[PDB]
Amino acid sequence: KFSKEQLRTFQMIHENFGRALSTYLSGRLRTFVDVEISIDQLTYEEFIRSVMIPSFIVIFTGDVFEGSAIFEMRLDLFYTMLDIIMGGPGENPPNRPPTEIETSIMRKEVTNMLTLLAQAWSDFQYFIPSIENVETNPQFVQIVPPNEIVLLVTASVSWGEFTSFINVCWPFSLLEPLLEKLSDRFWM
Amino acid sequence: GSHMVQLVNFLQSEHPQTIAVVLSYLDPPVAAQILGALPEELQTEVLKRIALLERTSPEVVKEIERNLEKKISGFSRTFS
């Protein structure tokens, strides 16, 4: 359950994550990439189902983190990106699960990406993202009980006639410890 | 031979671009062989791409390299 005060906190942070992100995707893709951040509260079951099968999911955590989060990228952007960083244009996004090199090359891509997220957070809780597991099928992750609420961070990656989404799933069972210390005792 | 076959069974999967890169460095006639042992859906594709490779990356190549060399039983000259 989230506060209407704490919500404005996360908006400020992640909005910033989209700024460095916008500038990262642009430097990868080699052409301008606008990114618009949207954030919302949703049931974990309600999010996990809005994930298209198959897709590229990466469940991560940090050192000071108690639990784990999700960083999902829709396959169209995924394959568009791989096409680029390999000397190609990126005109056809295939509809299958990424292979050995595909996932291995894209892993390091979401690590850099994940880092900036950790940097937009540096003012509240610095952390060094350490990616736990990668899975191509969502009905296989089940991070925490399906009823819990999540802070879903949505990033509208657009450019050209193209437009996809990058989601960061911030569970409440990971936000409660730093919720009470940072947005409550000294701030309030 | 055993090379070409593993390289095809392996390359058949990969992105039309992924193949495009690997085959790029390959020996031209051996290139046409694999490029040949693939279905016409990708030939045309892999080939359109192999044409448009002005670019070149030292970390993705050296990644694919360190990936075949631990899947295909031995990468030779070409990529060396």
Short mmCIF file of C-alpha atoms in Angstrom, two decimals:
data_model
loop_
_atom_site.label_atom_id
_atom_site.label_comp_id
_atom_site.label_asym_id
_atom_site.label_seq_id
_atom_site.Cartn_x
_atom_site.Cartn_y
_atom_site.Cartn_z
CA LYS A 1 0.00 0.00 0.00
CA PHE A 2 1.49 3.40 -1.01
CA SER A 3 1.27 6.99 0.24
CA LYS A 4 0.28 9.94 -2.01
CA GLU A 5 3.44 11.63 -0.70
CA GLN A 6 5.80 8.68 -1.21
CA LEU A 7 4.36 8.35 -4.75
CA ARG A 8 5.63 11.79 -5.73
CA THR A 9 9.06 10.67 -4.41
CA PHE A 10 9.28 7.72 -6.83
CA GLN A 11 7.99 9.86 -9.71
CA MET A 12 10.91 12.26 -9.21
CA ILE A 13 13.51 9.46 -9.07
CA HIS A 14 12.37 7.25 -11.94
CA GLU A 15 11.53 10.23 -14.09
CA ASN A 16 15.26 10.93 -13.83
CA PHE A 17 16.06 7.29 -14.63
CA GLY A 18 14.29 7.89 -17.92
CA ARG A 19 16.45 10.93 -18.72
CA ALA A 20 19.77 9.05 -18.49
CA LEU A 21 18.03 6.05 -20.07
CA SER A 22 16.76 8.13 -22.98
CA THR A 23 20.37 9.22 -23.50
CA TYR A 24 21.66 5.69 -23.19
CA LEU A 25 19.31 4.11 -25.70
CA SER A 26 20.08 6.94 -28.07
CA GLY A 27 23.81 6.21 -27.80
CA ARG A 28 23.18 2.52 -28.43
CA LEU A 29 20.64 2.81 -31.19
CA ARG A 30 22.69 5.55 -32.95
CA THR A 31 19.63 7.79 -33.50
CA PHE A 32 17.48 9.88 -31.08
CA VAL A 33 15.32 7.88 -28.60
CA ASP A 34 12.71 9.73 -26.53
CA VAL A 35 11.66 8.06 -23.23
CA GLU A 36 8.55 8.81 -21.19
CA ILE A 37 8.17 7.54 -17.61
CA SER A 38 4.84 6.34 -16.22
CA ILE A 39 4.42 4.77 -12.78
CA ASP A 40 1.55 2.94 -11.11
CA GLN A 41 0.41 0.62 -8.32
CA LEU A 42 -0.68 -2.84 -9.36
CA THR A 43 -1.19 -6.33 -8.05
CA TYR A 44 1.79 -8.54 -8.79
CA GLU A 45 -0.63 -10.93 -10.59
CA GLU A 46 -1.98 -8.01 -12.57
CA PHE A 47 1.48 -7.07 -13.79
CA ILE A 48 2.84 -10.58 -14.39
CA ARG A 49 -0.05 -11.21 -16.80
CA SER A 50 0.44 -7.99 -18.79
CA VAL A 51 3.81 -9.43 -19.82
CA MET A 52 3.77 -10.90 -23.30
CA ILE A 53 4.97 -14.47 -23.75
CA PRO A 54 7.70 -14.82 -24.60
CA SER A 55 9.66 -11.82 -23.39
CA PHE A 56 13.00 -10.90 -21.86
CA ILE A 57 12.71 -10.76 -18.08
CA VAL A 58 15.53 -10.12 -15.64
CA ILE A 59 14.99 -10.43 -11.89
CA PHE A 60 17.61 -8.50 -9.91
CA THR A 61 18.58 -7.29 -6.48
CA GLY A 62 21.37 -5.44 -4.76
CA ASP A 63 23.50 -5.80 -1.65
CA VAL A 64 21.35 -3.81 0.83
CA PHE A 65 18.16 -5.13 -0.80
CA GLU A 66 15.86 -7.59 0.95
CA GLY A 67 13.98 -9.37 -1.80
CA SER A 68 14.21 -8.93 -5.58
CA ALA A 69 12.84 -6.82 -8.41
CA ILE A 70 11.99 -7.30 -12.04
CA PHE A 71 13.38 -5.54 -15.11
CA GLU A 72 11.40 -6.61 -18.11
CA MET A 73 11.94 -5.49 -21.70
CA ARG A 74 9.44 -6.30 -24.48
CA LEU A 75 11.07 -8.42 -27.19
CA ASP A 76 10.49 -5.97 -30.05
CA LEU A 77 12.82 -3.40 -28.52
CA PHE A 78 15.09 -6.28 -27.48
CA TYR A 79 15.56 -7.58 -30.98
CA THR A 80 15.65 -4.09 -32.47
CA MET A 81 18.55 -3.33 -30.15
CA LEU A 82 20.45 -6.54 -30.90
CA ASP A 83 20.15 -5.82 -34.60
CA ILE A 84 21.74 -2.41 -34.11
CA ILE A 85 24.69 -3.31 -31.87
CA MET A 86 25.73 -5.88 -34.44
CA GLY A 87 26.15 -3.58 -37.41
CA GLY A 88 22.65 -3.98 -38.75
CA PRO A 89 19.66 -1.63 -39.10
CA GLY A 90 16.98 -3.44 -37.08
CA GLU A 91 13.93 -3.83 -39.24
CA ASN A 92 12.40 -7.13 -38.19
CA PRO A 93 11.72 -8.15 -34.62
CA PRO A 94 11.32 -11.99 -34.50
CA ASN A 95 8.84 -13.53 -32.13
CA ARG A 96 10.91 -16.14 -30.30
CA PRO A 97 13.04 -16.53 -27.17
CA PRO A 98 16.58 -15.10 -27.49
CA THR A 99 19.52 -17.49 -27.78
CA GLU A 100 22.90 -18.01 -26.18
CA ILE A 101 24.65 -14.94 -27.66
CA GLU A 102 21.44 -12.96 -27.80
CA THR A 103 20.82 -13.27 -24.03
CA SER A 104 24.54 -13.08 -23.21
CA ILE A 105 24.99 -9.89 -25.26
CA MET A 106 21.77 -8.39 -24.04
CA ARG A 107 22.53 -9.27 -20.38
CA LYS A 108 25.40 -6.79 -20.21
CA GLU A 109 23.07 -4.26 -21.91
CA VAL A 110 20.55 -4.38 -19.07
CA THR A 111 23.32 -4.24 -16.54
CA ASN A 112 24.41 -0.78 -17.73
CA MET A 113 20.78 0.17 -17.97
CA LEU A 114 20.10 -1.21 -14.50
CA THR A 115 23.03 0.73 -13.11
CA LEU A 116 21.54 4.12 -14.07
CA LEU A 117 18.43 3.05 -12.20
CA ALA A 118 20.65 2.53 -9.14
CA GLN A 119 22.05 6.00 -9.77
CA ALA A 120 18.70 7.75 -9.90
CA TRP A 121 18.28 6.13 -6.48
CA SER A 122 21.72 7.05 -5.11
CA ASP A 123 20.25 9.90 -3.08
CA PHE A 124 18.03 7.47 -1.10
CA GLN A 125 19.71 4.10 -1.16
CA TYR A 126 22.79 3.46 -3.23
CA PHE A 127 23.04 -0.15 -4.34
CA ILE A 128 25.01 -2.17 -6.76
CA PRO A 129 22.61 -4.19 -8.91
CA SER A 130 23.52 -7.86 -8.99
CA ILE A 131 21.27 -9.68 -11.44
CA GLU A 132 20.01 -12.97 -9.92
CA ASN A 133 18.20 -14.76 -12.76
CA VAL A 134 17.03 -14.31 -16.38
CA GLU A 135 13.88 -16.00 -17.72
CA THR A 136 11.97 -15.83 -20.98
CA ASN A 137 8.65 -16.96 -19.53
CA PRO A 138 6.82 -14.81 -16.94
CA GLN A 139 4.49 -17.47 -15.54
CA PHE A 140 7.81 -18.89 -14.25
CA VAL A 141 9.24 -16.01 -12.18
CA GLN A 142 6.78 -15.61 -9.25
CA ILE A 143 9.02 -13.31 -7.24
CA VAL A 144 6.72 -12.88 -4.22
CA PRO A 145 3.07 -13.76 -3.30
CA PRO A 146 0.63 -12.83 -6.17
CA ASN A 147 -1.52 -10.57 -4.02
CA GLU A 148 1.16 -8.06 -3.03
CA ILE A 149 1.17 -4.60 -4.51
CA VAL A 150 3.94 -3.32 -6.75
CA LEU A 151 5.29 -0.02 -7.90
CA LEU A 152 5.48 -0.64 -11.64
CA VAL A 153 7.81 1.70 -13.46
CA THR A 154 6.94 1.98 -17.20
CA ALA A 155 9.31 3.59 -19.72
CA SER A 156 7.87 4.52 -23.14
CA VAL A 157 10.90 3.98 -25.41
CA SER A 158 10.00 5.77 -28.63
CA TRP A 159 11.70 6.70 -31.92
CA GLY A 160 10.76 6.71 -35.53
CA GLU A 161 7.39 4.98 -35.96
CA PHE A 162 8.65 2.61 -33.24
CA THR A 163 7.54 2.54 -29.59
CA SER A 164 7.97 -0.09 -26.86
CA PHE A 165 8.07 -0.45 -23.07
CA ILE A 166 10.63 -1.17 -20.34
CA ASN A 167 9.15 -2.16 -16.99
CA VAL A 168 10.75 -2.16 -13.57
CA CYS A 169 8.77 -4.02 -10.97
CA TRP A 170 9.35 -2.59 -7.50
CA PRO A 171 7.56 -4.82 -4.96
CA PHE A 172 6.21 -3.44 -1.67
CA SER A 173 8.11 -6.19 0.25
CA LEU A 174 11.31 -4.46 -0.83
CA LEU A 175 10.08 -0.90 -0.33
CA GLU A 176 8.81 -1.25 3.27
CA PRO A 177 12.20 -1.19 5.05
CA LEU A 178 13.48 1.97 3.34
CA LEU A 179 9.92 3.36 3.29
CA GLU A 180 9.88 3.77 7.09
CA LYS A 181 13.41 5.19 7.46
CA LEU A 182 13.57 7.65 4.55
CA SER A 183 10.06 8.94 3.95
CA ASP A 184 8.97 8.69 7.61
CA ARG A 185 11.13 9.34 10.86
CA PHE A 186 13.35 12.30 9.83
CA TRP A 187 11.33 13.57 6.88
CA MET A 188 8.16 13.33 9.02
CA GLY B 1 32.90 -32.04 -42.86
CA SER B 2 32.06 -31.84 -39.14
CA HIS B 3 32.89 -28.08 -39.00
CA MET B 4 30.47 -26.68 -41.53
CA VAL B 5 27.66 -28.90 -40.18
CA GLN B 6 27.99 -27.78 -36.57
CA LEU B 7 28.27 -24.21 -37.86
CA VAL B 8 25.06 -24.60 -39.79
CA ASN B 9 23.07 -26.45 -37.11
CA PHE B 10 24.26 -23.58 -34.92
CA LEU B 11 23.89 -20.65 -37.28
CA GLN B 12 20.40 -21.69 -38.44
CA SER B 13 19.11 -20.38 -35.12
CA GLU B 14 20.74 -17.01 -34.73
CA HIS B 15 19.53 -13.56 -35.89
CA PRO B 16 19.81 -12.92 -39.62
CA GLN B 17 22.35 -10.29 -38.45
CA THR B 18 24.19 -12.61 -36.09
CA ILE B 19 24.80 -14.95 -39.01
CA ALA B 20 25.72 -11.95 -41.15
CA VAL B 21 28.56 -11.05 -38.80
CA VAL B 22 29.98 -14.52 -38.32
CA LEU B 23 29.86 -15.36 -41.98
CA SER B 24 31.41 -11.93 -42.65
CA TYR B 25 34.78 -12.80 -41.32
CA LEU B 26 34.54 -16.36 -42.71
CA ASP B 27 36.41 -17.51 -45.83
CA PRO B 28 34.36 -16.42 -48.93
CA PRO B 29 33.82 -19.88 -50.49
CA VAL B 30 33.14 -21.46 -47.08
CA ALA B 31 30.84 -18.49 -46.57
CA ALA B 32 28.78 -19.41 -49.59
CA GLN B 33 28.65 -23.01 -48.39
CA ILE B 34 26.90 -22.28 -45.04
CA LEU B 35 25.05 -19.42 -46.65
CA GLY B 36 24.02 -22.14 -49.04
CA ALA B 37 23.08 -24.81 -46.47
CA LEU B 38 20.48 -22.41 -45.03
CA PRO B 39 16.89 -22.05 -46.28
CA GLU B 40 16.04 -19.37 -48.90
CA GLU B 41 14.11 -17.33 -46.30
CA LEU B 42 17.40 -16.35 -44.68
CA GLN B 43 19.82 -16.68 -47.54
CA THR B 44 18.39 -13.62 -49.19
CA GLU B 45 18.21 -12.00 -45.78
CA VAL B 46 21.66 -12.93 -44.38
CA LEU B 47 23.04 -11.84 -47.74
CA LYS B 48 21.24 -8.47 -47.90
CA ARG B 49 22.80 -7.87 -44.45
CA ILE B 50 26.23 -9.17 -45.15
CA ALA B 51 26.21 -6.46 -47.79
CA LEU B 52 25.31 -3.67 -45.37
CA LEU B 53 28.17 -4.14 -42.79
CA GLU B 54 30.14 -0.85 -42.96
CA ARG B 55 30.10 -1.08 -39.15
CA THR B 56 32.04 -3.60 -37.06
CA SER B 57 32.24 -4.08 -33.28
CA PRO B 58 35.27 -5.38 -31.28
CA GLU B 59 33.27 -6.53 -28.27
CA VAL B 60 30.32 -8.28 -29.87
CA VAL B 61 32.60 -10.13 -32.25
CA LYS B 62 34.96 -11.12 -29.43
CA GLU B 63 31.78 -12.23 -27.64
CA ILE B 64 30.37 -14.42 -30.43
CA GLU B 65 33.97 -15.71 -30.80
CA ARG B 66 34.18 -16.77 -27.16
CA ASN B 67 30.75 -18.35 -27.71
CA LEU B 68 31.38 -20.58 -30.73
CA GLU B 69 34.77 -21.67 -29.33
CA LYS B 70 32.79 -23.19 -26.43
CA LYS B 71 29.93 -24.63 -28.52
CA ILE B 72 31.42 -25.52 -31.94
CA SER B 73 34.40 -27.77 -31.07
CA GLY B 74 37.06 -25.33 -32.37
CA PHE B 75 37.12 -21.92 -34.03
CA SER B 76 39.91 -21.55 -36.59
CA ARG B 77 41.87 -18.95 -38.66
CA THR B 78 39.06 -16.74 -39.90
CA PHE B 79 38.13 -15.23 -36.49
CA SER B 80 41.75 -15.44 -35.15
#
